[PDB]
Amino acid sequence: PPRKVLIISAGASHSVALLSGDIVCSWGRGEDGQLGHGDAEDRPSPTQLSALDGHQIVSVTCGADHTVAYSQSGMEVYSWGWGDFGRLGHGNSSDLFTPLPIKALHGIRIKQIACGDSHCLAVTMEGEVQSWGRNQNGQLGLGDTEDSLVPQKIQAFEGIRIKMVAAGAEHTAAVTEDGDLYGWGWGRYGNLGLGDRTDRLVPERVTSTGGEKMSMVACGWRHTISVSYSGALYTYGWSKYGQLGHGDLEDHLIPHKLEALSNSFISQISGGFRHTMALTSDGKLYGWGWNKFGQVGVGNNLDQCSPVQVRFPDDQKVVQVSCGWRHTLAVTERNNVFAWGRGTNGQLGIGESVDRNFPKIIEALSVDG
C-alpha cells in the first residue's frame, strides 16, 4: 500500500510532503538547501529526506526558500535552506543543506508553525508565540526593526491565547482562540487589514471583521485571507493580479467578504505569490489570481479575478491544498496528490515536465495513476 500523504506544503520553487510511517520527502528547487538532501540539485520527483528517518516528524512547513519540520514525541523543531537574516533560527546566518534542530525550541510543545519569505513563527500549546528572522518592517512583532537569528517570545500576546499564525513576504497575521484577528509587519498594500498602508512593529488587532469572529488566517506574498466562524471568506491587501477574488483588481485595506463563495463553508485556505486557493467543507477547491504558468489549475492561461473551481478526475473531493509562488499542490480523498503550474525546478514532482495548467497526478505518491 502506498503511504498515506498526511501533509503537503509548497514554497517558492519547492514542495515537501509528510507520509505515514513518519517519512519526509521533498522535491523542486534545491539550490538554497531547501530540499535537505545534503546536495544542492533540483529534484523532479519526490525524494525521501533520509536525515529525518526515525525522527517522528508530525508536520512540515515551507517558507519561500527554506523548510521547517517538527516532532511531537522528540520535542524538536528542524530547519534547513537559505540562512540569511536568521530565518532558520540557529543563532547564525549559515545556509543548511541538511536539517538541524532549532536548539532554542528544544523541549517546547509546538502547536503550529508558519514560514514567510525570511521570517518564521511558532505557536506553543499554551497559545504563546515565538518568532525569528528578518524584522526590517516589524514582521517579528517584537516592537523594533532588528533581525533576530534566534526565536524570541512575542510579549504583546501576554494574556492572549493564540490559535494560529500566518506569514507572507514581510508581514504576519494571527487569530486568537477567542476569534480575534491581528496583523503586523510590512503594510504598504493594505495587507494588515488595519485600514491604512503603514507598517506595524507589534501586533495590532483588526477591528473591521464584518461583525465576525475568525477561526483561520493565511498569507500570500502581499495579501491575506481569513475565515469566519460561519465559514465566510475574507480577503485583504494586494489585488494587482486579482488574488483577492472580488471580481476586480482593487486593493482592500480591511477584510472584505468574498461574496461569490457565501453559499459555501470554507474549511482550508492558502495564499500564493500572486494567487489564492480555498477549499469548501464539501471538498470543492476554488482558485483565483495570477495564472501565467497555469497555477490556478483551471485548464487555461487566463488570469482569474473571481473564484473558479479546480476540477479533478471523477470529481474526487479535495482534502488539502498548498500554494507555492508559481505552482499549487493538492491531496484528494482517494489519497492522490496532484500538482499544477510552473515545473521548471521540478516542483510538480512528476519527473521532467513542461508547465501544466490543470491538475496532474504525482504517481510516486498516489494510489491511482
CB 88 within 8 A of CB 80: yes
Choose between 292 and 334: whose C-beta lies nearer to a copy of itself. Answer: 292
Is residue 40 exposed (0-12), middle (13-18) or buried (19+ Cβ within 10 Å)? middle
Decide whether 22 or 31 has the Cβ nearer to a copy of itself.
Answer: 31
Specify the residue, 155 or 230, whose C-beta has the smaller distance to Mg ion. 155
The length of the chain is 369
Angle (CA) 8-11-15 rounded to 5° is: 45
Question: How far apart are CB 33 and Mg ion at their closest, in Å?
Answer: 11
The SS3 of residue 322 is strand
Q: How far is the CB of 178 from a copy of itself (least distance, A)?
A: 34
DSSP codes joined into one string, 234-297: EEEE--TTSTT-SSS---EEEEEE-GGGTTS-EEEEEE-SSEEEEEETTS-EEEEE--TTSTT-
Torsion of CA 10, 13, 19, 25, to 10 degrees: -160
Binding flag, residue 195, Mg ion (CB under 5 A): no
Q: Judge contact between 182 and 205, C-beta under 8 A.
A: yes
Find which of Mg ion, a copy of itself, none residue 353 binds, CB within 5 to 8 Å per kind.
Answer: none
Q: Find out whether 51 and 98 touch, Cβ atoms under 8 Å.
A: yes
Instruction: From the list a copy of itself, Mg ion, none, pick the one residue 307 interacts with, judged by a Cβ distance below 5 to 8 Å according to partner type.
Output: none
Q: d(Cα 85, Cα 98) in Å, to the nearest integer?
A: 18
**Residues 6 or more apart from 33 whose CB is under 8 A from it?**
40, 66, 80, 81, 82, 95, 96, 97, 98
Closer Cβ to a copy of itself, 111 or 326, answer by number: 326
Q: Which does 271 bind (CB under 5 to 8 A by kind): a copy of itself, Mg ion, none?
A: Mg ion
184 binds a copy of itself (CB under 8 A): no
| Least Å from the CB of residue 41 to a copy of itself | 7
Is residue 141 involved in binding Mg ion (CB under 5 A)?
no
Kindly write out the interface string for residues 212-251 of this chain, putting x where it contacts a copy of itself by CB under 8 A and - elsewhere. Answer: ----------------------------x-----------
Q: How far apart, in Å, are the Cα atoms of 158 and each of 127, 203, 257, 279? A: 9, 12, 30, 33
Q: Pick between residue 40 and residue 75 the one whose CB is nearest to a copy of itself.
A: 40
**DSSP 3-state assignment of 218?**
strand
In the set 209, 270, 280, 357, which binds Mg ion (CB under 5 A)?
270
98 binds a copy of itself (CB under 8 A): no
User: What x/- string results for residues 273 through 292 when contact with a copy of itself is judged by CB under 8 A?
Assistant: -------------------x
Q: Phi/psi class of residue 170: alpha, beta or left (left: φ > 0; alpha: ψ in -120 to 50)?
A: alpha
Q: How far is the CB of 248 from a copy of itself (least distance, A)?
A: 17
In angstroms, give the least distance from the CB of 208 to a copy of itself.
25
Q: Does 22 help bind a copy of itself (rule: CB under 8 A)?
A: no
* Nearest residue (CB) to Mg ion, 14 versus 284: 14
Alpha-carbon distance of 269 to 226, in angstroms, equals 8
353 is an interface residue for a copy of itself by CB under 8 A: no
Binding region for Mg ion (CB under 5 A): 37-38, 61, 142, 144, 270-271, 322-323
Binding region for a copy of itself (CB under 8 A): 31, 40-42, 93, 136-137, 147, 186, 188, 240, 292-293, 326, 342, 344
